[PDB]
Amino acid sequence: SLLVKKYCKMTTEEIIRLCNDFELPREVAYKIVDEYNINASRLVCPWQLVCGLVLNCTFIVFNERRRKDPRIDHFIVSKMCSLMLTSKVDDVIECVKLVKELIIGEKWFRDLQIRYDDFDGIRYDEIIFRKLGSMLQTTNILVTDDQYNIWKKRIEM
DNA sequence: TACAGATTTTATGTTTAGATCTTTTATGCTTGCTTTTCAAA
């Protein structure tokens, strides 16, 4: 598996072509390249770092269609194990959980979360009522209005 | 004015909460030396 081999050396072309497999814009891929170039000589398994960075970027870039459809979350992680030569899925989840704490406090990741409105999966208007202890926050019991509208369109079609 | 009772004043004892200083002991930095896994060939 690609998550096991150590001390690999990579080119910029491999990183920028692996970034375009998941449909990322140019500046996000450039920030992924720069985050790799900062920690170039102080790295053990670069494939894990690149995999988890392109993951944590493509949940943020594709959060709204993940809210539209949940199985895309099972589609991006299925595309990753079909490229990283890894049989199981839990290694990729532990990989992204491990690389998440390395970029959490940085300015570019904060600006990405601001610009694409991810904030660990929910809007600012929802997270400011969840942290305040507002009981009037939207609970995860009923479906959303857009989901009800597209379901009613599916019924009428 | 006048005296009985209530309250204040002054004085001392009892117990608790806490400060300050002193002494002995733990701990952390410094320097030198030796062990032991780690990225590279």
3-state secondary structure chain A: CCCCCCCCCCCHHHHHHHHHHHCCCHHHHHHHHHHHHHCCCCCCCHHHHHHHHHHHHHHHHCHHHHHHCHHHHHHHHHHHHCCCCCCCCHHHHHHHHHHHCCCCCCHHHHHHHHHCCCCCCCCHHHHHHHHCCCCCCCCCCCCCHHHHHHHHHHHHC
Q: How far is the CA of A42 from the C1' of B27 (A)?
A: 34
Is residue A53 within 8 Å of residue A85, measured between CB atoms? no
Specified resolution (Å): 2.7
Distance, Å, A106 CA → B41 C1':
37
Residue with tokens 């990405």: A112
Which nucleotide is at minimal CA–C1' distance from A43?
B39
Question: Who contacts A67 (Cβ-Cβ below 8 Å, separation ≥6)?
Answer: A144
How far in angstroms lies nucleotide B35's C1' from the CA of residue A150?
68
d(CA A98, CA A51): 11
Covered bases, chain B (protein CB within 7 Å):
39-40
Query: Which residues fall inside 7 Å of strand B, measured at CB?
Result: A 6-7, 41, 44
Which nucleotide is closest to A44, CA to C1'? B39
Method: cryo-EM
Alpha-carbon distance of A110 to A153, in angstroms, equals 37
The distance between the two most distant Cα atoms of chain A, rounded to a whole number of Å, is: 59
Task: With both helix axes pointing from N to C terminus, report the angle between A46-61 and A107-115 in degrees, rounded to the nearest 10.
Answer: 30
The nucleotide whose C1' lies nearest the CA of A7 is B39
Distance CA A2 to C1' B38 in A: 21
- CA–CA dist A6, A27 (Å, integer): 28
**Residue among A91, A97, A32, A92 nearest A61 (CA):** A32
Q: Nearest to residue A103, comparing CAs of A41, A60, A70, A138?
A: A60
Token pair listed for A42: 């102080």
Angle at A118 between CA A59 and CA A29, to 5 degrees: 50
Q: Cα A139 to the chain's mean position, in Å?
A: 24
* Amino acid identity at A87: S
> With contact defined as beta carbons under 8 Å apart, do A35 and A45 qualify?
no
Structure tokens at A6: 């150590």
CA distance A113 to A61: 9
Distance CA A156, CA A148 (A): 12
